[PDB]
Structure 1
Amino acid sequence: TKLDEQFEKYPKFEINKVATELNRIIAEYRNNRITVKFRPGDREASEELAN
């Protein structure tokens, strides 16, 4: 506001409290990473192909 011929601004304090669960989920993923795995079939040489 003008506030006696000036432009003092409103105080805007930020207390971030929503990132805790996001950090927990990210740590949960990074503790157990997953990747692609190929499973063999019912053939004579599917095991070597999968390996």
Structure 2
Amino acid sequence: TKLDEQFEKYPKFEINKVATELNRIIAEYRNNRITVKFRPGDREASEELAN
């Protein structure tokens, strides 16, 4: 506001409290990573193919 012919601004404080759960989820993922796995079939030589 003008506030006697100036433009002093409103104070705007931040207390971030919503990132804790997101960091928890990210840590949960990075603790147990996953990767594509190929499973064999009912054949005589499918195990070598999967390997």
Structure 2 residue matching 1:24: 3-state secondary structure: helix
TM-score (normalizing by structure 1): 0.99
Q: Which runs of 5+ in 1 are unaligned?
A: none
Instruction: Tell me the CA shift for residue 47 of structure 1.
Output: 0.2
Distance 1:39 1:45 in 2: 13
Q: Deviations over 1:2-34 (max 9, x none)?
A: 000000000000000000000000000000000
2:14 is matched with which residue? 14
Instruction: Tell me the CA shift for residue 40 of structure 1.
Output: 0.1
Percent of residue pairs identical: 100
Instruction: Tell me the CA shift for residue 43 of structure 1.
Output: 0.2
User: Alignment RMSD, CA only?
Assistant: 0.2
What is the total number of aligned residue pairs between the two structures?
51
Structure 1 residue matching 2:48: 3-state secondary structure: helix
TM-score (normalizing by structure 2): 0.99
